[PDB]
Design a protein around this ligand. Sequence first.
Ligand code: 8VD
Length: 227
Amino acid sequence: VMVEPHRHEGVFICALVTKNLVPGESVYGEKRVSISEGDDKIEYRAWNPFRSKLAAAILGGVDQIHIKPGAKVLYLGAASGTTVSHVSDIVGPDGLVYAVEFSHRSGRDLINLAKKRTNIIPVIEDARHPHKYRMLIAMVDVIFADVAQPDQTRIVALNAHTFLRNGGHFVISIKANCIDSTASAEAVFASEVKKMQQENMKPQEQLTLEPYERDHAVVVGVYRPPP
Ligand SMILES: FC(F)(F)c1cc(NC2CCNCC2)ncn1
């Protein structure tokens, strides 16, 4: 058995891989591995931690990612869809990934990616203005955010208050010098964690991403809003 289920459902090893929702096709040139046994066949896609902060976090030993089969995911800052494609593999056909990205150039890549993946909804919009797209987004189980803005906690909190179920979870990427380049990484991460707590986004774990990225954190937690 050459590829084993990782601890996280929907992830596998052998080197992280996910199960390819679109057998035969690569998204960004990644290695694909197909295994056949009699009539049976299954393909996996390599998941590069130098291109995907979520992969870096999984190889770094994150306890929970909450992105799992059947999950509904709001992905803020989807860029051209590199990580989104693996999220799509993980949540599978009964899951959903809204890919919010404000660049029209990257949006074109996301639209091309979603032609083959029925579980991706490209939302080509500024995540600071969720009122512009709130009629497209059903309540989600998880928010993944990589918007890399000084005000990203406020941005993520606003989307959470609008779209994230009570008891749902969040996975937030924090690049310290995109939030405040004159502060130390520790000061940025502490300040962001503090701000998250004040929005009822309760961190349950936080880790950095060395050796894949410098001064880059991932914070995972649970959203527990008031009545
Ligand atoms: F800043 C924002 F308004 F929240 C936002 C950002 C965003 N995309 C990121 C993706 C990572 N690089 C920087 C742009 N797509 C939509 N909204």
